[PDB]
């Protein structure tokens, strides 16, 4: 099982799209490409993907089975991704959700996400949830909008700098 603790972030460098899937070539951060190889199953934005090819710090994943309930087909070259290598999150993304709002501040970012009933209707505060590979506790909830707090230090190792109103994220429902 995964911790939902992002070890570092990669940058999508290449994306070859074909009729069935898309081959994403992700440039990994120093130290992470040495910990994986072909057949390695890891978490990219919290989604279980299998390394299909690797050369230096360029890691490739064929993204297909996940294309329909994930955010991958909407990412482009240059985008940052959260990365986690195995040793809680299973890596099976339930679906996609949008950032309803986001309030930055000294401490960190209070991000509001509108969770559709299609993903889960039985959410309670204090529960954990995975957003793009980051496991966080639901600090607050009102109907379908949940509130999660992001520590500012995350900007150094995660993709969170891309969160804005209406930005789509991978959601994994826990427990
Ligand atoms: C071991 C394992 C490997 C997987 N590899 C891929 C993959 O290479 N490409 C993909 O699109 N989906 C893959 N999936 C499915 C995806 O990670 C995710 O769980 C769901 O597709 C989200 O709807 C994999 C799932 C597991 C359990």
Swiss-Prot record:
Lumazine-binding repeats lie at residues 1-87, 88-175. Its cofactor is 6,7-dimethyl-8-(1-D-ribityl)lumazine. Binds 1 6,7-dimethyl-8-(1'-D-ribityl)lumazine non-covalently. The keyword Lyase does not apply. Keywords: Luminescence, Repeat. GO terms for biological process: bioluminescence; riboflavin biosynthetic process. GO terms for molecular function: riboflavin synthase activity. Antenna protein that modulates the color of the bioluminescence emission of the luciferase. In the presence of LumP, luciferase emission is shifted to higher energy values (shorter wavelength). This is Lumazine protein. It comes from Photobacterium leiognathi. The gene is lumP.
